[PDB]
Amino acid sequence: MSLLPVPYTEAASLSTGSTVTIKGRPLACFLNEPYLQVDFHTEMKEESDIVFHFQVCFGRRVVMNSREYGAWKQQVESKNMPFQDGQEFELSISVLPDKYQVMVNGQSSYTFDHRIKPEAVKMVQVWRDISLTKFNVSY
Amino acid sequence: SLLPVPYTEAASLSTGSTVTIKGRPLACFLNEPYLQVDFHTEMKEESDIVFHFQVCFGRRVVMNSREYGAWKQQVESKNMPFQDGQEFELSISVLPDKYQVMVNGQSSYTFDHRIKPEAVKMVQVWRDISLTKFNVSYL
Structure with a gap:
């Protein structure tokens, strides 16, 4: 049923101006907390730093965070919820010199300042309770 | 692997029933699947649990129930018989007073009946696992 198999793992490289586009839909109603x-x-290995x-x-x-030297660092939490129950969503993660900007359905929704340089990224993994129709990293 | 996840089945339970689940996590334990x-x-996913x-x-x-649409008293255990990267066998037995949860033949968790098991009409298995076996015993 999911157009792209989940978990979805792709080799990737990022720098200022890169955009990660993800189109998908949760596998359950919001009451079930997917x-x-x-x-x-x-x-490339799943156990690598995040x-x-x-x-x-x-x-x-x-929740947003990083995993450095195998340990989860300072957690950032947001109660902003633009995702709609039972709907397909479009997630767009842009790389800026100082942060990531996260857009949901074309609206600025979350930000996260760079801890590790984005140039250290070699892989992107998309997983958990979603079906996936689109994944793209711009170059 | 052979059974899709989420896996949903019509079921009925009483004393002596056993729910057998054979599967494997989709990620290393470091990634918290x-x-x-x-x-x-x-049968509906939004129904009480x-x-x-x-x-x-x-x-x-974590163990709980969802009654009249609300999560009730959460029960937490740090008991972890599941082994990193391994296939597991989960056996949930219905006893007159509680469920007994066995992992790879070890009695690992228990949960006293809040709602009678005779009220169950459906079983759902989901989140970050591949599923090789699902069975509900009868008679």
Whole structure:
């Protein structure tokens, strides 16, 4: 049923001006709290450090963090919830010199200042309770 | 792998029933994949949950019920018999007073009946696992 298989793992490189586009839909109603996770990894292996971790608990909150030297760092939480129950969404993550800008359905929704340089990213993983129709990294 | 996830099946339970689940997490424990098993009062996903069993692999287990649309008293355990990167066998037995949850033959968790197990009409298995076996015993 999901057009693209989930978990979805792709080799990627990022710098200022790069955009990561993700089109998908949660697999459950918001009452059931499905999650979405997007991780920008330093290496191809899943256990590698995470430069940018973006986790949505649909209908509840968004958590952002990094995993450095194998440990989760300072968690950032947002109760901003532009995602709509049972709807397809479009997620756009832009790389700016100082931060990532996260757009949901074309609206500025979240930001996260760079901890690790985006130039250290080698892989992007999209996983948890979503079906996926589109994944793209601009070059 | 052979059974799709989310996996949903019509079911009925009473004393002596066993729900057998064979599967494997989709990620290493460092990435905190989840497993969720919900015993529902109706076929619809938004229905009440008699028994909610949620594993955050390598971290914790949470159990609860959802009654009249609201999550009730959460039960938490840091017991972790699940092994990183391994296939597991989960066996949920229905006893007169509680569910007994066995992992790879070890009695690992228990949950006293809030709603009678006879109210269950559906079982849903979802989140970050591949599923090789699902069975509800009868008679």
